[PDB]
Design a protein around this ligand. Structure first.
Ligand SMILES: CCCCCCCCCCCCCCCCCC(=O)OC[C@H](COP(=O)([O-])OCC(O)COP(=O)([O-])OC[C@@H](COC(=O)CCCCCCCCCCCCCCCCC)OC(=O)CCCCCCCCCCCCCCCCC)OC(=O)CCCCCCCCCCCCCCCCC
Ligand SMILES: CCCCCCCCCCCCCCCCCC(=O)OC[C@H](COP(=O)([O-])OCC(O)COP(=O)([O-])OC[C@@H](COC(=O)CCCCCCCCCCCCCCCCC)OC(=O)CCCCCCCCCCCCCCCCC)OC(=O)CCCCCCCCCCCCCCCCC
Ligand code: HAS
Ligand code: HAS
Ligand SMILES: CC(C)=CCC/C(C)=C/CC/C(C)=C/CC/C(C)=C\CC/C(C)=C/CC/C(C)=C\CC/C(C)=C\CC/C(C)=C/CC/C(C)=C/CC1=C(C)C(=O)c2ccccc2C1=O
Ligand code: HEC
Ligand code: HEC
Ligand code: FES
Ligand SMILES: [Cu+2]
Ligand SMILES: [Cu+2]
Ligand SMILES: [Cu+2]
Lengths: 51, 55, 38, 30, 281, 51, 162, 184, 56, 550, 56
């Protein structure tokens, strides 16, 4: 409750679920872009659409 | 949203709260509102999955 | 180099001769494909 | 207000900025 | 004369009769200078481009260095004469003589005036009030000079102040909330009141020598106070010194200014100003 | 103090008893409860669409 | 203490219409209570657009603006947080422009008198002084100590009763 | 033989910010003279500890920022980067050092309302606290700018004028350290 | 920005009565002058692309 | 032979201005955006005075409320001084200063654009307080601090006033950084700091004074907003305070008056040797005069504080007399440069003469007001409001219209019309006899300034009617000027001529009108104080040296 | 990090209660703003009525 003793550790429950879930795959997503930008070779492929 | 329907009861039948949130104690609420207050409060990390699902 | 320390400048002229020619290869690639169509 | 209006404002300046600003880094400009 | 001073009332104090005397000595000395420059701008309206010179013959010259040294000292000498006469007058004004002979607090609160009488001691030693109390002051935990013969002056009473017309008169200028201004237009002088003038290194109080006329004169507020700044018209009267001794003694038994001015056959309300209808509602 | 500035309805002429009135909270347009009172100038502002 | 279940249900029944911890759009909303406490959040604001919940000279009845137990409970719910003569003179100096003359700075007709203050009492005055008012700057902590607030409240109360 | 326009355009501007701290000193001295009967910290005590170990960091920041601006004039793009990260992390120690001094003086003494000294302290040293945070922004926007081009003399000129801003902030704090702690 | 006018009323300090009259008058006026400030913007962006081709 | 187009292109294409306005660094275009946007604010601020002036005519309080009057001399005093008169300084500076020296551009071209757009959004915040419920700033443009508090002035609009003058306040500090470093670093080869026309000196000197005044105001308005939004005890009368604002605002207040006065002394110095065909009499005398007024204007701030109790009176008395000496020298160097040479009263010359006629009463009543016994009676009266409408309205109306009529066929290439130009002067000056001359009489007998309503028993009725009839004549007079500009912008007689006024002095009259995008096609050989008079007239060079020095 | 919808502050939907900020999400905000801007235009073509809600 609002004037309790462990109220501060409750108010950091759902932010600690956010900056540890979301910052994990943000950093996995950043590292997987930086593998594509820096190691997978740049290619320019042209495909004739037959539409 | 598949997660969030494992805990939600969508009826409108009236029932008093008698749960864990201290201001809303003994308030005539629907069961759709009491289980929406059980996701936020009485499910471990259920407020997170509820807030992700709205954003 | 790094954000604080450089590379020994033999590995710099190799990473900028093969970098201004790896984009010049990209420029004559589309130029010799645009002239094939038109 | 604390309902949908400052939450809806915080969508466009935090969420969609960091969802367009990512795509301008993954994608190109042509 | 009257037309040379640009719309100036003849001052009722002799410290303002010196002030109007400096004004007429300053406007005429400026209408001298303002007609020299107009006599040179409109003299070049006799110097047009006339049809007599087919070629440009303007006689171009730029640097007449024995002339700017003349027309720098001459504007410096007119100032150095008319600066000496602006320190003598501001020394004769604000004289600060420690025989008060009446002290009138003004206590300009939010959007009206609250005059209060303090110790009055004539040169004959006749009236000698001597004891406007500080017991009301110590209840406020302040600085405002509270008195016993104080004039409330609500928004429809338009507070008529009464001071005798032959003695030294001292105005302790405090204020309650906002910076107001204190200006009788016949006292050719202001000193706009401040909230806490002891802490702002302000002078807080001035004196006039005497009132050399009788009648009743207007009072106005000048520095801005807020919405009803234009409606803070106080009003002063100048009864005889023999009639003023009967004023406070009728007042000390307990009446109002609508009743205390009837005992000395004065008009009970203000005569040069009136309450405002839009402020009353 | 303000009784002469009261205009009764043509049909609802005598539906009051001693400086009292009873109007519905459910407003006459889309049915939100009108609750704001405005004790200075008598207005029955409703929060949903500001009638 | 005040029952916070009653306080929540009273908030929902009577204040949710203009306040969701936010302020009412129409005119000027009361807004979130600053330094929320029984002393100021309890004290009503009859002056202005806001309606007066507490009714002076009111016996217990089913139709009522507010309930002494209801008021305290709601003031508490909103407040989650998650020389008498000498005092009067000081109040006139600080509030001399508006309080002086017992009048109102905003409106000449409006006054600090009991008819203007309705069901006034020392506690209601102290509380509005502490956090001041909707249009008046708060005085506690920021400007005046508790003795000074208590003394100025007493002076205003004695002046208005007499 | 041309007098480095951007350097002239900064020191002409840096004389304006001295007048911004002229109206903030003139609030301090007029609340010390015409309001201080006793010494101006009446319920508080200004500790020189945690005020001397944070003003000896800014003085050493100017001893490392000027070593960075020596590297821009020579051509060391990486020597310019090394001595500004020292200057950034020691300027960030000043904000975190003084920012802990403000928390020590709110939950223990005078906050910004409710004190005559409490308003002329959190604004004289407060707008200096925003000219350091505003200065550390200019180190991020300069070191990241050295990562994008060939380090022209225009990249060096941009590092001259950020250095002049940091020495200005350093000297103004000496005019605040030798005013409010020693001339109490 | 007219559905949240009560939040514009409280926080931004404007009105609750005048935020519909800047909406109801604005519903006709503002989409009429965004047509003019974008048709004359999109053409002036075209003329900026011809100065980089003619001159460089 | 010599194939041309009959009449030049009136308006351009569909879209040659909307973009290329947003993305511009051309000082010739940002100069024309300061000028046009300030006349948007010369009408918004100026129409507020006509609503002030009809309430005062009939002695009742007719249609404006009491509180609505008090928020219409603030928003009139703010918009006229700060949102019209301080940016039109940098309006004429962006048009002319890179031209009068041999410069291609201002020094920092993206702080020229940023200094404009800080003004245009800083000005629409302060007068964006009419949208507030409680209206804009009730307190005056001086904003004295027991009146401007959290509980005396509670509404926003007063707070929007404060942060509309720090955004525009930043917009002039950043503009004075340009105007110094342009003059310091970007002159033509052969242009020295001297032999450079006096308008560029006045922009050089006032750009110093902007850096002294406007940061000190910005430091005061962050001190006032800390007192209002936060709780603070700066500007509190128990802590100095209510005379602290009297010393921080007026230390801004008088050297902002003198950044309004001096740059429009330089336009008037620019016009006299063009129309009276002989040089500036005492050129370097005007250089040393401006630096003195640039130095004296800062140490005289408390002449606005004579009747607020106690300041040091003999210091600010004598030093306020000291500005009358160099401005008196600047009048000797205006009649003297107009003296022997042959006159032609075209509309740029006509307005500079009406400058000399009307500024004199403002300067004469300035030293009337500078002495405290003459000031103790009229210090917050309608004698003051009479004073600064002979001394602002000279520099800001009769010397901006002197400069707009003089650099309209340089910035646009069209001659602004003269038959519709002489009408605009004599609808202004005849409607300026009638407006502000009578306030000298009206205020010294007891009508103080900032009053909404007065009483009909006073003798103020038959003199406020005179000052209201004339105020509409001064309001009608803007109508044959807008019609002059709106027609002669795109219509109007072309100038295929590098100097339309015949005898131009400075370096801008040697380039084409309008100039190219870097102002110059051929720089002339600079050897004297006026380049474009040695050029266009080679046979006068033996007379600019021998026939000088009487 | 950012809270989105506290349904525990305002209680259950009871038709007697009231909420001062009754607003939809931003995708449905233009529908609520459309109701506020249309003026009170009703018709009454017969004994029946046509409310303001036909214009939305
Ligand atoms: C206060 C709320 C704030 C909350 C935060 C929410 C903000 C959203 C996140 C923004 C995400 C942006 C993209 C991120 C992924 C890309 C990452 C990347 O590197 O790609 C490179 C990318 C270019 O890559 P490229 O496509 O390959 O190159 C093509 C050409 O270069 C192309 O050349 P060009 O001509 O096309 O120019 C391209 C460039 C043009 O360049 C620019 O225009 C600007 C460049 C810098 C932008 C970012 C600066 C800082 C970001 C915000 C900082 C906030 C501080 C205050 C917060 C207070 C909170 C209390 O434009 C862009 O790249 C688009 C950037 C989008 C701007 C974001 C706007 C932020 C909105 C603010 C919301 C405020 C929240 C209010 C809510 C309040 C509460 C309800 O450049 C960038 O985008 C840089 C962005 C970096 C931001 C990340 C955070 C910075 C951390 C560094 C701190 C260093 C510490 C000390 C270091 C010591 C010394 C070094
Ligand atoms: C909460 C508080 C947190 C603190 C506030 C957040 C940070 C605010 C923004 C950070 C500013 C950093 C900019 C400098 C970055 C840089 O690399 O400098 C290179 C730059 C040279 O670049 P460049 O490419 O060679 O361009 C020269 C070419 O000729 C090309 O010439 P140009 O025309 O293209 O460009 C001229 C160039 C260089 O021109 C100059 O050299 C003239 C120097 C003028 C500096 C203007 C700084 C503005 C600070 C205003 C201070 C007053 C406070 C507010 C009142 O100026 C600039 O590039 C940047 C102009 C900055 C405009 C921003 C105006 C708003 C800032 C204030 C926000 C305060 C928020 C409070 C809200 C309540 O050097 C400088 O700009 C001067 C260094 C001074 C940096 C100190 C910043 C002071 C912060 C004040 C704290 C308050
Ligand atoms: C850009 C606009 C302005 C200029 C220029 C200007 C020039 C002066 N002003 Fe001023 N001003 C005051 C004194 C002077 C003096 C001495 C000069 C000088 O720069 C004027 C220079 C003199 C001349 C240009 C004449 C030169 C011609 C010749 C031929 C020289 C020889 C003649 C002499 C030496 C005459 C002396 C002899 C006599 C017999 C009078 C005073 C006085 O203590 C106040 C306070 C009033 C109050 O209490 O509120 C004041 C107030 C204002 C205000 C209002 C502030 C407010 O709202 O409170 C504004 C807006 C303003 C603008 C301007 N003012 N002035
Ligand atoms: C730059 C400096 C200034 C200029 C220029 C100026 C012009 C005038 N003033 Fe003034 N002024 C007064 C009268 C006039 C008149 C008749 C004019 C004239 O030159 C103005 C000419 C009129 C116009 C120019 C209006 C033309 C309107 C038209 C043609 C229609 C407009 C149509 C539309 C659609 C508008 C929107 C247009 C768009 C483009 C959107 C009076 C009263 O008779 C007071 C006393 C208030 C008091 O009690 O203290 C006063 C007070 C002041 C104060 C002291 C403020 C204070 O105490 O707080 C200052 C500093 C000042 C400066 C200036 N003043 N003036
Ligand atoms: C493109 C388009 C809508 C074409 C319509 C075609 C057509 C002719 C239709 C005829 C029918 C008519 C007249 C429809 C009228 C429009 C209508 C009533 C509904 C259409 C809804 C709709 C599809 C809208 C799309 C527009 C939209 C929301 C975004 C596009 C804006 C663009 C191009 C980029 C966004 C850039 C961006 C991410 C900015 C973020 C930062 C900013 C400035 C956000 C601004 C912002 C926005 C945009 C909010 O929606 C918002 C909502 C609630 C609170 C705050 C905000 C807020 O701050
Ligand atoms: C349970 C407490 C509570 C309820 C319920 C409540 N208010 Fe208020 N109201 C306050 C308090 C406390 C203030 C004083 C302002 C402040 O909090 O700073 C106030 C102030 C106001 C004001 C401003 C008055 C002024 O002079 O500043 C208005 C208007 C107002 N309320 C309207 C309403 C309306 C309309 C309702 C219901 C329809 C309502 N209030 C219900 C506690 C309440
Ligand atoms: C600068 C403004 C301001 C100051 C200072 C101020 N007040 Fe007020 N006060 C108001 C306003 C406005 C109201 C009207 C209530 C409202 O705002 O809704 C008010 C109302 C009151 C009321 C209620 C009167 C009624 O009938 O409702 C009391 C009691 C009061 N004030 C006491 C004080 C005391 C005690 C002081 C100082 C010791 C003080 N005030 C200083 C502005 C102020
Ligand atoms: S719901 Fe539309 S008016 Fe309340
Ligand atoms: Cu007053
Ligand atoms: Cu007044
Ligand atoms: Cu001045």
């Amino acid at each position: 409750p609002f004037g309790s003793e462990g109220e501060f550790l409750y108010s950091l429950a759902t932010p600690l679920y956010g900056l540890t879930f979301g910052l994990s795959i943000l950093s996995i997503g950043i590292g997987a872009v930086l593998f594509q930008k820096k190691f997978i070779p740049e290619e320019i492929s042209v495909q004739d659409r037959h539409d | 949203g598949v997660w969030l329907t494992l805990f939600f009861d969508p009826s409108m039948a009236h029932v008093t709260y008698d749960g864990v949130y201290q201001p809303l104690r003994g308030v005539q609420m629907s069961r759709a509102y009491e289980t929406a207050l059980d996701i936020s409060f009485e499910v471990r990390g259920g407020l997170f999955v509820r807030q992700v699902h709205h954003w | 180099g790094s954000f604080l320390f450089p590379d020994p400048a033999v590995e710099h002229e190799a990473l900028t001769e093969a970098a201004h020619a790896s984009e010049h290869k990209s420029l004559t690639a589309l130029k010799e494909h645009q002239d094939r169509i038109h | 207000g604390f309902g949908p209006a400052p939450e809806g404002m915080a969508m466009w300046i935090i969420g969609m900025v960091a969802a367009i600003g990512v795509a301008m880094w993954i994608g190109s400009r042509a | 004369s009257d037309a040379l001073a640009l719309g100036w009332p003849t001052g009722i104090t002799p410290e303002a009769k010196l002030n109007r005397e400096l004004w007429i000595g300053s406007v005429i000395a400026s209408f001298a200078v303002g007609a020299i420059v107009w006599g040179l701008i409109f003299w070049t309206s006799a110097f047009h481009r006339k049809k007599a010179t087919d070629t440009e013959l303007p006689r171009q010259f730029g640097y007449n260095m024995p002339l700017e040294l003349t027309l720098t000292v001459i504007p410096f000498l007119i100032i150095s004469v008319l600066f000496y006469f602006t320190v003598v007058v501001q020394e004769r004004m604000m004289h600060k003589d420690p025989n008060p002979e009446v002290v009138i607090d003004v206590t300009a609160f939010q959007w009206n005036w609250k005059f209060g009488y303090q110790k009055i001691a004539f040169a004959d030693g006749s009236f000698d009030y001597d004891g406007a109390d500080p017991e009301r002051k110590e209840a406020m935990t302040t600085y405002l000079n509270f008195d016993k013969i104080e004039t409330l002056g609500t928004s429809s009473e338009i507070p008529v102040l009464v001071l005798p017309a032959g003695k030294r008169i001292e105005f302790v200028l405090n204020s309650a909330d906002v910076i107001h201004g204190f200006w009788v237009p016949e006292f050719l002088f202001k000193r706009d009141v401040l909230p806490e003038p002891k802490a702002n290194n302000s002078d807080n109080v001035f004196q006039v020598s005497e009132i050399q006329q009788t009648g009743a004169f207007v009072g106005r507020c000048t520095e801005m106070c807020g919405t009803f700044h234009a409606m803070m018209n106080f009003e002063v009267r100048v009864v005889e010194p023999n009639d003023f001794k009967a004023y406070i003694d009728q007042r000390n038994a307990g009446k109002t200014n609508a009743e205390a001015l009837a005992a000395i056959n004065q008009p009970p309300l203000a005569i040069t100003t009136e309450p405002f209808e839009s402020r009353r509602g | 103090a303000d009784m002469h500035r009261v205009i009764k309805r043509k049909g609802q002429e005598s539906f009051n008893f001693g400086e009292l009135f009873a109007y519905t909270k459910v407003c006459s347009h889309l049915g939100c409860p009108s609750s704001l009172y405005e004790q200075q100038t008598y207005r029955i502002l409703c929060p949903c669409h500001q009638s | 203490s005040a029952l916070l279940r009653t306080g929540k249900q009273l908030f929902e029944t009577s204040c949710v219409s203009c306040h969701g911890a936010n302020l009412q759009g129409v005119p000027d909303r009361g807004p979130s209570l600053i330094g929320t406490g029984e002393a100021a959040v309890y004290f009503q604001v009859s002056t202005g657009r806001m309606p007066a919940m507490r009714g002076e000279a009111q016996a217990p009845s089913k139709p009522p603006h507010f309930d002494e137990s209801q008021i305290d409970a709601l003031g508490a719910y909103v407040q989650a947080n998650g020389d008498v003569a000498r005092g009067g003179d000081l109040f006139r100096l600080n509030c001399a422009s508006c309080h002086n003359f017992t009048g109102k700075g905003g409106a000449l007709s409006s006054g600090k008198y009991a008819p203007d203050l309705g069901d006034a009492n020392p506690a209601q005055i102290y509380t509005a002084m502490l956090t001041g008012p909707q249009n008046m700057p708060k005085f506690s902590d920021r400007q005046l100590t508790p003795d000074e607030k208590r003394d100025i409240v007493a002076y205003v109360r004695e002046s208005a009763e007499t | 033989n041309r007098p480095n326009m951007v350097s002239v355009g900064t020191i002409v501007w840096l004389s304006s910010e001295l007048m911004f701290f002229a109206g903030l000193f003139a609030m301090y001295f007029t609340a010390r003279a015409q309001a201080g009967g006793a010494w101006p910290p009446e319920p508080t005590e200004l500790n020189l500890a945690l005020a001397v170990p944070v003003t000896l960091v800014l003085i050493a920041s100017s001893f490392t920022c000027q070593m960075g601006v020596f590297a821009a004039e020579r051509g060391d793009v990486f020597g310019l980067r090394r001595w500004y990260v020292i200057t950034f992390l020691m300027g960030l120690f000043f904000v975190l050092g003084q920012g802990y001094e403000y928390i020590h003086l709110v939950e223990h003494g005078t906050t910004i309302p409710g004190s005559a000294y409490g308003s002329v302290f959190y604004l004289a040293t407060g707008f200096h606290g925003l000219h350091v945070i505003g200065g550390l922004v200019a180190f991020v926007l300069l070191l990241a700018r050295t990562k994008m081009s060939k380090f022209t003399p225009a990249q060096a000129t941009a590092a001259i004028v950020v250095s002049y801003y940091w020495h200005f902030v350093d000297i103004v704090w000496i005019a605040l350290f030798a005013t409010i702690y020693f001339v109490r | 920005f007219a559905c949240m006018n009560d939040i514009i009323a409280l926080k931004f300090h404007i009105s609750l009565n005048a935020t519909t009259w800047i909406g109801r008058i604005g519903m006709v006026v503002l989409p009429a002058i965004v047509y003019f400030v974008a048709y004359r913007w999109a053409i002036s962006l075209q003329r900026s692309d011809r100065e980089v081709l003619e001159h460089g | 032979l010599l194939a041309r187009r009959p009449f030049p292109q009136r308006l351009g294409p569909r879209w040659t201005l909307l973009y290329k306005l947003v993305t511009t660094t051309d000082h010739k275009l940002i100069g024309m955006m300061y000028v046009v946007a300030c006349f948007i604010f010369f009408f918004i601020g100026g129409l507020m005075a006509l609503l002030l002036r009809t309430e005062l005519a009939v002695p009742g309080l007719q249609f404006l409320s009491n509180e609505q009057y008090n928020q219409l001399f603030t928003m009139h005093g703010t918009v006229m001084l700060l949102f019209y008169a301080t940016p039109i300084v940098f309006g004429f500076a962006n048009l002319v200063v890179p031209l009068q020296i041999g410069a291609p551009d201002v020094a920092f071209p993206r702080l020229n654009a940023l200094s404009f757009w800080l003004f245009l959004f800083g000005a629409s915040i302060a007068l964006g307080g009419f949208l507030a419920p409680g209206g804009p700033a009730d307190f005056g443009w001086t904003a004295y601090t027991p009146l401007s508090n959290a509980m005396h002035s509670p509404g926003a609009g007063g707070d929007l006033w404060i942060f509309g003058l720090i955004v525009g306040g930043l917009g002039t500090i950043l503009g004075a950084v340009n105007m110094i470093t342009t003059v310091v670093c970007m002159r033509a080869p052969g242009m020295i700091m001297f032999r450079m026309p006096i308008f560029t000196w006045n922009i050089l000197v006032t750009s110093v004074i902007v850096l002294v005044a406007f940061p000190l105001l910005t430091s005061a308005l962050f001190g006032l907003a800390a007192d209002r939004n936060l709780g603070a005890h700066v500007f509190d009368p128990a802590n100095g305070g209510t005379m602290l604002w009297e010393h921080l605002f007026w230390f801004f207040g008088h050297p902002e008056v003198y950044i309004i006065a001096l740059p429009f002394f330089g336009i008037v110095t620019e016009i006299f040797p063009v129309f009276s065909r002989k040089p500036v009499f005492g050129y370097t005398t005007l250089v040393y005069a401006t630096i003195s007024i640039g130095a004296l204007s800062i140490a005289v701030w408390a002449h606005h504080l004579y009747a607020t109790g106690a300041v040091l009176l003999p210091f600010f008395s004598f030093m306020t007399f000291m500005i009358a000496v160099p401005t008196g020298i600047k009048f000797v160097n205006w009649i003297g440069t107009m003296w022997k040479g042959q006159l032609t009263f075209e509309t740029p010359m006509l307005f500079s003469v009406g400058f000399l006629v009307t500024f004199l009463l403002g300067g004469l009543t300035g030293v009337i007001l500078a002495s405290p016994p003459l000031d103790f009676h009229v210090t917050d009266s309608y004698f003051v409001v009479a004073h600064f409408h002979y001394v602002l309205f000279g520099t800001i109306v009769f010397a901006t219209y002197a400069g707009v009529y003089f650099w309209f066929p340089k910035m646009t290439g069209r001659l602004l019309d003269d038959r519709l130009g002489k009408l605009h002067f004599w609808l202004t000056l005849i409607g300026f006899h009638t407006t502000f001359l009578v306030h000298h009489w009206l205020g010294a007998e007891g009508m103080p300034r900032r009053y909404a309503d007065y009483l009909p028993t006073d003798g103020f009725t038959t003199l406020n009617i005179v000052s209201t009839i004339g105020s509409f004549i001064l309001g009608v007079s803007m109508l044959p000027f807008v019609w002059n500009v709106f027609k002669s912008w795109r219509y109007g007689e072309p100038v295929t001529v590098d100097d339309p006024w015949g005898y131009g002095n400075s370096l801008e009259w040697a380039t084409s009108c309008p100039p190219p995008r870097h102002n110059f096609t051929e720089l002339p050989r600079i050897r004297s104080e006026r380049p474009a008079f040695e050029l266009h007239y080679p046979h006068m060079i033996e007379r600019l040296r021998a026939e000088s020095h009487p | 990090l950012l809270t989105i919808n506290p349904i525990w502050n305002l209680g259950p939907y009871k038709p007697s209660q009231v909420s001062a900020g009754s607003q939809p999400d931003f995708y449905m905000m233009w529908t609520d703003g459309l109701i506020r801007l249309w003026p009170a235009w009703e018709f009454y073509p017969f004994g029946h009525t046509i409310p303001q809600g036909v214009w939305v």
